[PDB]
Design a binder for this molecule. Structure first.
Ligand code: INI
Ligand code: INI
Ligand code: INI
Ligand code: INI
Ligand code: INI
Ligand code: INI
Ligand code: INI
Lengths: 154, 154, 154, 154, 154, 154, 154
């Protein structure tokens, strides 16, 4: 059986991140986590670009555009969608995942999915550097892995 | 880390809006909000075009068509879908988001999602200039931002 | 602000309708409504073509095919899906909207969505010429509007 | 108003069927129903081809492949997905309808949807030759109709 | 009626597997099951390649890339998504099935769906070599079948 | 074992129908269904005769009389009896089936039983072109079958 | 540690099956499953013999007799015992397993145990090609395995 795997050394990678302004109480902490984890895995802070957008509906648009430049080894997406009174949540979540998925697919560039989607605020706090760790961290890790594996893919 | 961001000055942008006739009790107020916010950010009223359609199922059709002219820096979509007795709601909401998403994607022109989707009338009133502000306003703001950011995208 | 709008005069339009045989108790009344409203807005009965299909799963297939002839200014779709015991309903509803949406999109020809989707029979009767009016009527009206607006679109 | 309709005479049609092995307790009875109805409408048993697949996830793959040969006037799809403990059901149902829909659409060849999707076994028995008739039968009928109508479509 | 069927002899097939790291408590056992079943059906262990990814969101990306090499007769996908507190689960499950489906479709290479999606841990244990058998096993079997059938498809 | 079966081609058959005026809200839709299904199976509209009677008590009288002319290959009976306050229903239903049965028996001409007998109006709507299909349709189908089989009977 | 294992290639095996007539609603489907799985693993249909018996009490008798011919590499036993009002069930189940066990033991020929024993009919349907797969299938698989392993046993 032949195993193909990306390892975790970030040295020399170039990474784009798209971050939503909506719920930026949470999303800035996700960006912090991601920043940190990348640098401590060896990415140069000079090699990270960060595009801010209004909210998660816009993430796929900025993601595909950044991917299609060919400047980046992997793209990180970061957002938080917390349930409200109505179903609007869902349409957003749904479109967001679907487009992120499409952006990797059309582009051949790894696009990591970091949209924390929850029922309430304490839940979002759990995944932004508390009890359940930090999704921005795990995302940064998966991005390095995917950038390394995709080199086996040309 | 290099931050890429669109700022909020609307001076010299050209904006298309597609507005649904269905629930126009609400949707005209969303259009008012949007109009106002654009002008006070510096868009010229002569630079705004507005296409009315029957309802939200039609918004993606008019949106892609307006986008594909290449006349506009960003497109604003405005609609209200309030839950009734049956599931029809959902099919509409769903198709509407999906097409709006597709229209930006195929065209490279920012298309903002302004469809207020709710369980009842008082909810729709909350997001049309009452308690929860005015979705048409927030939309106008996001459109300016996206038009400015996308200039970093060529 | 420049308003673009289709008006309601049907004089000289050519219209295709696709109607599902399933629940034709209801769907023939929707077709009647549509027929009437078109003629009284000035469409010539000689200018209306009607394709019958087995059920709503087939509507998108006949719709795209009729659209792609280029004979018609707008297409009307008519169907009724009433909930049963299982989830089958949903898959049908879902696929049906999605394909109808796609058919307009690929073709550039307006395709109106007239599928009444309900929980029970009395509900379907409400939207087929009773309490809630007649969906076939409203559809005919939206088709005229879209045919007129799309002339602003070339 | 000009009516376009496919009639029910199967004489001289060539039909492909894709049948899922999963829940073949039910799915073989659906295939029996379909076989019978086709022959008694005049299709030659020599003109029917049947591709077996592992389950409903695979139906769209075999369907598009059979359609794209251009040998068949219409394709029949047959499957049964019965709810279990988890949500897996849904993902299967969903993907299955979507692909079947896509296969007709890309190919221009009618693909009938015959996937019985239920909450329990007695429900699946109701639609496989009991109380609610036989879905394989109704499917065979719709396939003949669509093959005949699509001749109006070239 | 002419039956087309893939038989179960794996002799001489070449198989790619993509396995998610997330919930690898379960997913390594699925990989074990798959390995075993392939070898005992006659696939050479030298003819199996295995790509590890961060989680199920990434499976479609690695799957399409492996498929598009043209080295493999069929691709096996393996993952486990267990429900948590929020809706995140669903977005993952959904995107994952959809992309896997797309990967077969664009590529013409069979891609088997082996993502175990559950409400709790004991459920995932049931489908990883306990009470409900081993999904990795059933997957390996379906992959051989599809590789054999698709030879009837060229 | 030698199978004797009537097939479904209506070409060249001559069919008589007896329809009850009572509950003609429903019974005209049954007649529509029957008309349609016959023509699309190849019966010539010139070859169908339709006798209207006051209600189901009279159906057997008109049925035997039409049968005894020897003009028709099969007779279709259509009626609806909905439960009221008293037992009258039953006497009607009972006499009606019994006479229809007798009419085939004395005459040697197939007489199909199409009397929808129900507890309420929504039930009758279910069997007249809604949820449970259309009894007039199924009847037309059985009539063709019986006309074909009875040719094996001389 | 030295692993001894039978692989799954049925090519050239000769298999006897004993099937109970009792509950043959279920037991014929088990036989179908078994037939199929054997052929698709490469057993020649000419190399399968099938002995029908009255019920499960008789299975051990026919099994030992077939085993003792020395014609077969493995024997498959198939039966269904569904609980009734009294304890009779148990005596049958018990004797049946015990004898099947004895038959392998005295003979040195693998005898697979395929008696589905349940509390009700829906349970038996679950294990005959529905929700829980098909016991006749799993049995056929185990028989091939045991026939292959026992060659390590001389
Ligand atoms: O990132 C988010 N975007 C949200 N804004 C909606 C949307 O993403 C767009 O910014 C705008 O709707 C038009 O594109 C959200 N809510 O609405 O609640 C949310 O929770 N999270
Ligand atoms: O914009 C809306 N359109 C609606 N109309 C349906 C649809 O958008 C189309 O106008 C027409 O159905 C065919 O295209 C809605 N409802 O039906 O309730 C609604 O709530 N909101
Ligand atoms: O138009 C409808 N089609 C239906 N038939 C299913 C389907 O549309 C197809 O005709 C056939 O399934 C294969 O294409 C429906 N139900 O099944 O209930 C329904 O309610 N409405
Ligand atoms: O046809 C079905 N396929 C099923 N198998 C899943 C799937 O269709 C594939 O065969 C395999 O998962 C990978 O392609 C089902 N269940 O899982 O329950 C089901 O109910 N019905
Ligand atoms: O394979 C899984 N991936 C999961 N991780 C999410 C995702 O698949 C990605 O690895 C990452 O989110 C960005 O691509 C899951 N959860 O989050 O729970 C899970 O249950 N299973
Ligand atoms: O066909 C029907 N005939 C009915 N009329 C009774 C009868 O069939 C005769 O027309 C008349 O009674 C004398 O022959 C019914 N009811 O009375 O309710 C009925 O429900 N349906
Ligand atoms: O195979 C079965 N045999 C049964 N018949 C009993 C028995 O196996 C013999 O055929 C006969 O009793 C004398 O040998 C069963 N029941 O009695 O219910 C049963 O459930 N299943």
């Amino acid at each position: 059986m032949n195993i193909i795997q990306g390892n975790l050394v970030g040295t020399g990678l170039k990474i784009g991140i798209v971050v939503g302004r909506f719920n930026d109480f949470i999303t800035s902490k996700l960006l912090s986590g991601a920043e940190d984890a990348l640098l401590r895995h060896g990415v140069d802070t000079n090699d990270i670009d960060v595009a801010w957008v209004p909210g998660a509906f816009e993430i796929p648009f900025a993601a595909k555009k950044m991917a299609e430049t060919k400047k980046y080894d992997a793209i990180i997406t970061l957002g938080t969608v917390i349930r409200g009174a109505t179903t609007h949540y869902d349409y957003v979540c749904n479109e967001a995942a679907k487009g992120i998925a499409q952006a990797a697919n059309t582009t051949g560039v790894p696009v990591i999915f970091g949209i924390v989607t929850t029922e309430n605020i304490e839940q979002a706090i759990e995944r932004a550097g508390t009890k359940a760790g930090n999704k921005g961290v795990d995302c940064a890790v998966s991005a390095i892995e995917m950038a390394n594996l995709n080199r086996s893919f040309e």
